[PDB]
């Protein structure tokens, strides 16, 4: 299987507002960069969108080492998602899970790969994640896309 290293980040200039993501896929030394800006979104949604877009970019089943500093994505993946699915993607009050559109979009990408998650804390020592942060903030300055699933 192809082995690919992925690094991601995403955020808004003000939250909620313009936002964007940056992602880096690296395969055998070569890199591909992804980045886009959205006119109105949130920090959590861009953090999650970054990971989604990177995984969706894979066109064959891979072994993936994915580095993200997002507490939201980390906790969704390690704590929440298995129980959300059991509950038909609703919380105890029977409301759809917040950002269910993005979580389901993620869930469908996760199942297609053998993923090793490397949760990062801090940009220090993590130059690819820092670079993802710069891409995100640059895309946010000139957003072209609509974050359609975002609901205030």
UniProtKB/Swiss-Prot annotation:
It catalyses: Endonucleolytic cleavage to 5'-phosphomonoester. The keyword Cytoplasm applies. Its EC number is 3.1.26.4. One of its GO terms (biological process) is DNA replication, removal of RNA primer. Residues 1-141 form the RNase H type-1 domain. GO terms for molecular function: endonuclease activity; magnesium ion binding; nucleic acid binding; RNA-DNA hybrid ribonuclease activity. Its cofactor is Mg(2+). Disruption phenotype: In a strain that encodes a retron, the msDNA is abnormally sized. It is found in: Cytoplasm. One of its GO terms (cellular component) is cytoplasm. Keywords: Cytoplasm, Endonuclease, Hydrolase, Magnesium, Metal-binding, Nuclease. Changing residue 133 to H/N: Slight decrease of activity. InterPro entries: RNase_H, RNaseH-like_sf, RNaseH_domain, RNaseH_sf, RNaseHI. Its main location: cytoplasm. Binds 1 Mg(2+) ion per subunit in the absence of substrate. Requires millimolar levels of Mg(2+) for maximal activity. Has low activity at micromolar concentrations of Mn(2+) and is inhibited at higher Mn(2+) levels. Can bind a second metal ion at a regulatory site, or after substrate binding. Mg(2+) 1 binds at residues 9, 47, 69. The keyword Nuclease applies. HAMAP family: RNase_H. PANTHER family: RIBONUCLEASE H1. Belongs to the RNase H family. Monomer. Endonuclease that specifically degrades the RNA of RNA-DNA hybrids. RNase H participates in DNA replication; it helps to specify the origin of genomic replication by suppressing initiation at origins other than the oriC locus; along with the 5'-3' exonuclease of pol1, it removes RNA primers from the Okazaki fragments of lagging strand synthesis; and it defines the origin of replication for ColE1-type plasmids by specific cleavage of an RNA preprimer. Involved in production of retron derived msDNA (a branched RNA linked by a 2',5'-phosphodiester bond to a single-stranded DNA). This is Ribonuclease HI. It comes from Escherichia coli (strain K12). The lineage of its organism: Bacteria, Pseudomonadati, Pseudomonadota, Gammaproteobacteria, Enterobacterales. The gene is rnhA.
């Amino acid at each position: 299987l192809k082995q690919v290293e992925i690094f991601t980040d995403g955020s808004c200039l003000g939250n909620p507002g313009p936002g964007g993501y940056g992602a880096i896929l690296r395969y055998r030394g070569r890199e591909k960069t992804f980045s886009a800006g959205y006119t109105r979104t949130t920090n959590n949604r861009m953090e999650l969108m970054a990971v989604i877009v990177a995984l969706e970019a894979l066109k064959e089943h891979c072994e993936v080492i994915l580095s993200t500093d997002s507490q939201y994505v980390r906790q969704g993946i390690t704590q929440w998602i298995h129980n959300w699915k059991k509950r038909g993607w609703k919380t105890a009050d029977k409301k759809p899970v917040k950002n269910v559109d993005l979580w389901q979009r993620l869930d469908a990408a996760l199942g297609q790969h053998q993923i090793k998650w490397e949760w990062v804390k801090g940009h220090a020592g993590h130059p690819e994640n820092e670079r993802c942060d710069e891409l995100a903030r640059a895309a946010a300055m000139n957003p072209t896309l609509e974050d359609t699933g975002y609901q205030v």
